[PDB]
């Protein structure tokens, strides 16, 4: 199916506690495969998935030099950002970067992304055209003017249509037994009385990959959106994800409720009921 590669950088200043820490993590779909941390004893790009371990010494060396240069650039950006917002040198601030490419089943580029956030708020983003920027405020307009003057978007587009697509295609081939495998959810419904007249029905989905899933409860075939407690999809720690959806039902009406599960790992969607 469709695949993505994304890099996620976090630079956090810490006045009085040294220079800003730079951390980067790289993903293919929901699978993390690399990390880089400026606070590590000997900062270097490290493998975090089995299929990337085969990359030679030149891979780890080149990438380590890229992150080290980026950490320095982010520290310069944090200083500039503090000035654009007339902020004191005393407070901590965060600069996040998120970029990458989406490709279809045939490896062709579907969409590129290259964007940033300052203190958790969108700051600037490369538009879908990969040629122009959208600035959130008058401070990001300064970054936009600088990047327009430097024709910065052209280098971003070249990576997104080039290296990004070519390396993602390589990683998908090298990690095909996992990256091209969808593990379906293992499901069950639990029943817990709350009182003499109500019980919770909880619909479980376990051991699935990728994370994308749809879990819903219906009462007489009608979606129970407002009355369902739906937890965020969570990692199990073994590459898979979990999720549950619960509803409070009147005692004796359990058979009117159906849990519906949609996941790419499933031949067809599941319809589950409480089986006493």
């Amino acid at each position: 199916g469709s695949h993505s590669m994304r890099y996620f950088y976090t630079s956090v200043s810490r006045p009085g506690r040294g220079e800003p820490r730079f951390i980067s993590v790289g993903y293919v779909d929901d699978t993390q495969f690399v990390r880089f941390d400026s606070d590590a004893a000997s900062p270097r790009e490290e493998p975090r998935a089995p299929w990337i371990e085969q990359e030679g010494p030149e891979y780890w060396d080149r990438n380590t030099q890229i992150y080290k240069a980026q950490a320095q650039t982010d520290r310069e950006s944090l200083r500039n950002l503090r000035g654009y917002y007339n902020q004191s040198e005393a407070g901590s601030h965060t600069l996040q970067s998120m970029y990458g490419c989406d490709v279809g089943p045939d490896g062709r580029l579907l969409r590129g992304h290259d964007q940033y956030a300052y203190d958790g708020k969108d700051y600037i983003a490369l538009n879908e055209d990969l040629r122009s920027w959208t600035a959130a405020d008058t401070a990001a307009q300064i970054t936009q003017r600088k990047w327009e003057a430097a024709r910065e978007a052209e280098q971003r587009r070249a990576y997104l249509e080039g290296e990004c697509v070519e390396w993602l295609r390589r990683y998908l081939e090298n990690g095909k037994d996992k990256l091209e495998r969808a593990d379906p959810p293992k499901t069950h419904v639990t029943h817990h009385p709350i009182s003499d007249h109500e019980a919770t029905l909880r619909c479980w989905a376990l051991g699935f990959y990728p994370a994308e899933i749809t879990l819903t409860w219906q009462r007489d075939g009608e979606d129970q959106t407002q009355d369902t407690e739906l937890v965020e999809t969570r990692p199990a720690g073994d590459r898979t994800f979990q999720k549950w959806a619960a509803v409070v039902v009147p005692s004796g009406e359990e058979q009117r409720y159906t849990c519906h599960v949609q996941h790419e790992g499933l031949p067809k969607p599941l319809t589950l009921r409480w089986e006493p």
Partner: peptide
């Protein structure tokens, strides 16, 4: 593999 920017900063 990660991207290299122009390096002129924000």
């Amino acid at each position: 593999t990660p991207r290299v920017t122009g390096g002129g900063a924000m």
